[PDB]
Design a protein around this nucleic acid. Structure first.
Length: 833
DNA sequence: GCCGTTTTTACTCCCGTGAGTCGTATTA
DNA sequence: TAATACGACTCACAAACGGC
RNA sequence: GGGAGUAA
């Protein structure tokens, strides 16, 4: 019969899934996963002489092998890699992939098609040949289940990995090119056409589908979906999350290369693995009540939800029959029409997203309990693998709710109303007042739960669907009592995740204070404190500032507005917390003045002109630059202690990524180094960067010419000293932050009886009954890390040491601790995280 | 010393070329 | 060796930081 | 390379 490993790896997941939950859902689970793919093949036979192309291709492949074997010397690079599969399947993939690249894309460059074929003809190995054998399972005919499978009881045919495209990026292209070369013989199905021959930045070799096939023609994107059963625990670097062995396994760390992942194989980080597995084991379910509303309201032509764009396409106005001649005809309406294209696009992009979020919610709607596998980026931060996530937008989060609930009232009912207030535009005011807001609108609520389609008050709120999810849940308590079991996730977000951490690692105060780390009766709005200082400088320039100038650069001449002009324009608009909102955050991520100009222009200026409320900004970019200057000055005196901390990190990474120099001698005393540090819970994070190099292949295409594609080399080279310096600072806070969230979960859980979690990087959600403990757990775990590892001191110890000499004189060193009592956070009401 | 280029990471979603020449690793 | 493929190298259609 | 969305 068959043979070779794979029979067991395809049977074990099904068998174990059919023992605990029955062959019922064990059949559906695999079909839903393998449904990548399974629909992708169904999309190919669609679409789908062919009964003449396949036999012609197979015949060529076999003849080509005979020609190569007869000749002497070095055999084509693609030859030996193409002898791994049966020639019949080699042809099959070539037809599939070439069609897939040309149908859903309008180009298409040769080095993209060849790469896609090479990757497909690799697994293969691999993962493809298994697909056919694993596909048999779900196409045959035709509790306690929400239990995680024991990691030690898992077969070795599930532990393995290889989540990176093996072979040499080069070797993968060779395979594809030779396949296309054999695909153009015989038949060819596709034509190789030269594009822009001569232009340095436009010359390319693109594959064109033959006109005969184009007239004979007939994502998103079922590769990563939620799990119906608890995901496989992460034991090693690869294999965790999903169960099927017919697919390529997931990587614990999403890296740029295979080598970067392989640096984790033998590290030993129990606190990192434990955190991911607990977060991964969180049982979720679709919020039926919210889903029933989302299916109806999104269908409306004029939805109550603001962000909800057309619909209404809005045509191009108007061409006043003037042609014509001359500066009246084309200026105007050219500029007026250009404004419409961007108006519709910013609508189009927002609508296309909306369409996808609903299609995804509809797919995973029904079903008892549903699960989501969890990954991490190259840093600490935890991500849900599937497209449909509890980490998505308002609607997506509203459509979801936890499966297992704990009853419930008195303690939980208090924070349930707090979450309700948070969903609305009420989250920067004391808790007793938040409770008051809910108790005042008892008539507004209940009625929205009565008839949500008739009463659209919840739609006007800050988080429409999430507030609606609270409304149905709030009404449930009023009718059943304080025994009414609830499972709505109550989110707890850190005021400003970043400045909070910088204030914690360097014992700020001042800063935060400002970011709600200390217990206060009033909510500390750091974005409002900066805006207060901005408005203070803004008023100063209004009466005493610079006048308008004419720079006359060459008509051509333009007016450069003075500080008096811009001050008046901003005062006639109202500079609030939202104007400086993103600017205050981005700085805490190593941003500069020029960078703020781009932010304010995108977040404040442009949308104001688009809304017809930005007629003040006569010179939009000069106005964005002026505001960027005001923030840079005002925020600096706000995160002082923070600035130095960043400058200490920036200097550390700058000198680590720097290449050594000597007196006329090219002495390599020290190479460029990757910035490395370990975050509190044990997660290691490296911030390296290799010099990006480009190589060219020499391929005698069809014996006519030499196809030489410049490709991005996967082969490692020299350490990029510039990125090593510019990346050392960020990566630091990155990793740390990542672990933080991870630590939170573990701790909280292990301690209290909290089983379910809703994690959005710095947001913490759980059932109302366990909300009180989580609200306390987030505090304890952050107070446990610092002190307990002095992030800054711990980070300093990592590169102690790694500094050369005549470098430590340029590395200060060290942000002093303030007078903040870490225990006060436990008493702080408005620091939700 | 002068000139040119660039200005948090990552992930997800949507909408440079062949020819000429040469060395070399490979196999009947 | 004698023949075969192909990679490797070259040539021609506003302020600050890093590289040449 | 560009655009959109989400998270820090």
């Amino acid at each position: 019969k068959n043979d070779f490993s794979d029979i067991e790896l395809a049977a074990i997941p099904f068998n174990t899934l059919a023992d605990h939950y029955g062959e019922r859902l064990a059949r559906e689970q695999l079909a839903l996963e393998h449904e990548s793919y399974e629909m992708g093949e169904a999309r190919f036979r669609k679409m789908f002489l062919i009964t003449t192309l396949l036999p012609k291709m197979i015949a060529r492949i076999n003849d080509w092998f005979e020609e190569v074997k007869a000749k002497r010397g070095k055999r084509p690079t693609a030859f030996q890699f193409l002898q791994e599969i049966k020639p019949e399947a080699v042809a099959y993939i070539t037809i599939k992939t070439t069609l897939a690249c040309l149908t859903s894309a309008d180009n298409t460059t040769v080095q993209a098609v060849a790469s896609a074929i090479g990757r497909a003809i690799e697994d293969e190995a691999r993962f493809g040949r298994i697909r056919d054998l694993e596909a048999k399972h779900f196409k045959k005919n035709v509790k306690a289940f929400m239990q995680v499978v024991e990691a030690d009881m898992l077969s070795k045919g599930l532990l393995g990995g290889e989540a990176w495209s093996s072979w040499h990026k080069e070797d993968s292209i060779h395979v594809g090119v030779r396949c296309i070369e054999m695909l153009i013989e015989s038949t060819g199905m596709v034509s190789l056409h030269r594009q822009n021959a001569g232009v340095v930045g436009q010359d390319s070799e693109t594959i064109e589908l033959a006109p005969e096939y184009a007239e004979a023609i007939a994502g998103i994107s079922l590769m990563f979906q939620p799990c119906v059963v608890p995901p496989k625990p992460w034991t090693g670097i690869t294999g965790g999350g999903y169960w099927a062995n017919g697919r390529r396994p997931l990587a614990l760390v999403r890296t740029h290369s295979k080598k970067a992942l392989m640096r984790y194989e033998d590290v030993y980080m129990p606190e990192v693995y434990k955190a991911i597995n607990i977060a991964q084991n969180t049982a979720w379910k679709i919020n039926k009540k919210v889903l029933a509303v989302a299916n109806v309201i999104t269908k409306w032509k004029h939805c109550p939800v603001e962000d909800i764009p057309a619909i209404e396409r809005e045509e191009l106005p108007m061409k006043p029959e003037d042609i014509d001649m001359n500066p009246e005809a084309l200026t105007a309406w050219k500029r007026a029409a250009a404004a419409v294209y961007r108006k519709d696009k910013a609508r189009k992009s927002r609508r296309i997203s909306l369409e996808f979020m609903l299609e995804q919610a509809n797919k995973f709607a029904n079903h008892k309990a549903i699960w989501f596998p969890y990954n991490m980026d190259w840093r600490g931060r935890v991500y849900a693998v599937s497209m449909f996530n509890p980490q998505g937008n308002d609607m997506t989060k509203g459509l979801l709710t936890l499966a297992k609930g704990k009853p419930i009232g008195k303690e939980g009912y208090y924070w349930l109303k707090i979450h309700g207030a948070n969903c609305a535009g009420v989250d920067k005011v004391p808790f007793p007042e938040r409770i008051k807001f809910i108790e005042e609108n008892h008539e507004n609520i209940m009625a929205c739960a009565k008839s949500p389609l008739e009463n659209t008050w919840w739609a006007e709120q800050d988080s429409p669907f999430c507030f609606l999810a609270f409304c149905f849940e709030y009404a449930g308590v009023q009718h059943h009592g304080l025994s009414y079991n609830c499972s709505l996730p109550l989110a707890f977000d850190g005021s400003c995740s970043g400045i909070q951490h910088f204030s914690a690692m360097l014992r700020d105060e001042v800063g935060g204070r400002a970011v709600n780390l200390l217990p206060s009766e009033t909510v500390q709005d750091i974005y409002g404190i900066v805006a207060k200082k901005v408005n203070e400088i803004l008023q100063a320039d209004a009466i005493n500032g610079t006048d308008n100038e004419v720079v006359t650069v060459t008509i051509s001449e333009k007016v450069k507005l003075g500080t008096k002009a811009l001050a008046g324009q901003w005062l006639a608009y109202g500079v609030t917390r939202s104007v400086t909102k993103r600017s205050v955050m981005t700085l805490a991520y190593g941003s500069k003045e020029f960078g703020f100009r781009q932010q304010v222009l995108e977040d404040t200026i442009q949308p104001a002109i688009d809304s017809g409320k930005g007629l003040m900004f006569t010179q939009p970019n000069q106005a964005a630059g002026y505001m960027a200057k005001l923030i840079w000055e005002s925020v600096s005196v706000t995160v002082v202690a923070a600035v130095e901390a960043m400058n200490w990190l920036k200097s550390a990474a700058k000198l680590l990524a720097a290449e050594v120099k000597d007196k006329k001698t090219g002495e390599i005393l020290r190479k460029r180094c990757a910035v490395h540090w370990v975050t509190p819970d044990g997660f290691p994070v490296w911030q390296e960067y290799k010099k990006p190099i480009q190589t060219r292949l020499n391929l005698m295409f069809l014996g006519q010419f030499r196809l030489q594609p410049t490709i991005n080399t996967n082969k490692d080279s020299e350490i990029d000293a510039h990125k090593q310096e510019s990346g050392i600072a960020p990566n630091f806070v990155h990793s740390q932050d990542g672990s933080h969230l991870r630590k939170t979960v573990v701790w909280a859980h292990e301690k209290y009886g909290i089983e379910s979690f809703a994690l959005i990087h710095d947001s913490f959600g759980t059932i109302p009954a366990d909300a009180a403990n989580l609200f306390k757990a987030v505090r304890e775990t952050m107070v446990d890390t610092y002190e307990s590892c002095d992030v800054l001191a711990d980070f300093y110890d990592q590169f102690a040491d790694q500094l050369h000499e005549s470098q430590l004189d340029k590395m200060p060193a060290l942000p002093a601790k303030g007078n903040l009592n870490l225990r006060d956070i436990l008493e702080s009401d408005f620091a939700f995280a």
